[PDB]
């Protein structure tokens, strides 16, 4: 398995690590029909997204996507600084496909 | 995807954004039959509920509206600010949709 | 919906409102078989549970029974302040029906 | 229902009350195949279980296990003091049937 | 039942305590399709992952792999100091068996 978040990062198509070094500046959460997620953005002006379930998931990420979206609130609200993000850029805003706190 | 609250707001029928600036005042928790929500209302003595799940909730909205709960509560006990809310006028207390916390 | 946990508290049989205006003194949780309850006390001597899951609750209400005993148990570790409690009293302690925090 | 600990304690046979008036000192949590479980110990020198579950327990005590494991999770995190466990003195080391904290 | 970490670990072949007595340096955690997992460091150098739920697990394993890494989240949040790591050495990063933490 990977040793590290940005390994793991490489091991998919379509995705970059941005090295946030930063708490989160605001929290975003919807429970609206089909738009069922969170956002998250930082001082930096960058804008994530946690995607709403879809057909592109395997069973196996249906826990961790509701597992990262808990992840993020507690952080938001701990203002528990962000290393980094991998995601994913083929979505707009960018999507979370992992996350790592230091510091 | 929508990138913030408004832009999410913005594609419901029955919704309006409105802008807290504030903390829960009090948080409201019910598990009596039929009534299963919450209610939460700020100083200024607004009020708004996460509505029991329904025939007007699709079925990705189930974890979702339980999220909702779970994070309403953490705000108001961390007492964290509120920045805003996408709510649903059509209902009364007004019905949350979405919601933004920033620092 | 009701606006207040005094408006919902009246459309049931078997209830009353009781103001507490105190944080939780004792917390008290079981997973003994046949007594999987939780009960709570306050410095005034009140007693309150949350019932073992029963016939007495529909569907709808299992995850409600679940919550209710998350919310008492970090209400208590946080020395919330819980402002009203809505109880059964057909039942011995009290059993919460809805509660409110508010400082 | 039962009101305290020690009326709940006593509806079982094997079991008996420990005062314990103290803060956990140390937690072990595994997740082993079969020996699923938590360990507390406390500077009395009394170490306590939540056993794996197994056919000695009901379905409805399912639920109550899983609670009672993250009941001593945050318990142990937040130095929070224990008041009295009530055990069941035929296991070794003994096994946790409820817990009380008081303020 | 073993009333220690270290008698656990010895019930298992490919396992080891690796003695932290140090907070996570850092917390990573992922929802990428087949790599749903966590990964943490120690200012040591050392690393571990609980691994992404597979075939070698049973089903008393799978809620106690989401409690794992439950346990590592709020444990990285809160800074506590993490006592011993029993690990299976089969795996690279090694994996979590299981964990102490002691006051
Ligand atoms: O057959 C195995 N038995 N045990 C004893 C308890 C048990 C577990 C599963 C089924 C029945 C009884 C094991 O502990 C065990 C471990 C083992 O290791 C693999 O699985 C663990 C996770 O449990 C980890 O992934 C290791 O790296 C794997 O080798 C294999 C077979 C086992
Ligand atoms: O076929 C694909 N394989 N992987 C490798 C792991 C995996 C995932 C699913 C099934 C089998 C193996 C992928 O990682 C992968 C990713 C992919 O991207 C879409 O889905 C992700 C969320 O997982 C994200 O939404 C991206 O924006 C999507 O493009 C497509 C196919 C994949
Ligand atoms: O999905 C929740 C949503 O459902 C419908 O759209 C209703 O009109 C709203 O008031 C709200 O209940
Ligand atoms: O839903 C729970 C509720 O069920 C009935 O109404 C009982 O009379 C109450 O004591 C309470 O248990
Ligand atoms: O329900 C749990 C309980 O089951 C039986 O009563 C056993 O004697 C106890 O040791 C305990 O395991």
Redesign the interface.
């Known amino acids: 398995?990977?040793?590290?978040?940005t390994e793991?990062c490489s091991?998919?198509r379509n995705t970059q690590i941005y090295t946030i070094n930063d708490?989160?500046?605001?929290?975003?959460?919807?429970?609206?029909?089909?738009?069922?997620?969170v956002?998250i953005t930082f001082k930096s002006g960058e804008?994530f997204?946690?995607?709403?379930?879809g057909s592109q998931?395997?069973d196996?990420?249906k826990?961790?996507?509701?597992?990262?979206?808990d992840?993020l609130?507690?952080?938001?609200?701990?203002?528990?600084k962000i290393?980094k993000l991998?995601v994913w850029n083929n979505?707009?805003?960018n999507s979370?496909?992992?996350?790592?706190?230091?510091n």
């Not at 398995?1 to 978040?5: D, E, G, K, N, V």
């Not at 997204?49 to 379930?53: D, L, T």
């Not at 826990?63 to 979206?69: F, G, H, L, T, V």
């Not at 609130?73 to 528990?80: M, N, V």
């Open positions: 398995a990977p040793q590290t978040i793991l091991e998919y708490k989160i500046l605001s929290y975003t959460e919807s429970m609206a029909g089909k738009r069922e997620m956002i804008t997204q946690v995607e709403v379930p998931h395997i196996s990420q826990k961790a996507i509701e597992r990262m979206k992840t609130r507690i952080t938001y609200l701990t203002e528990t290393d991998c979505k707009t805003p979370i496909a992992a996350i790592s706190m230091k």
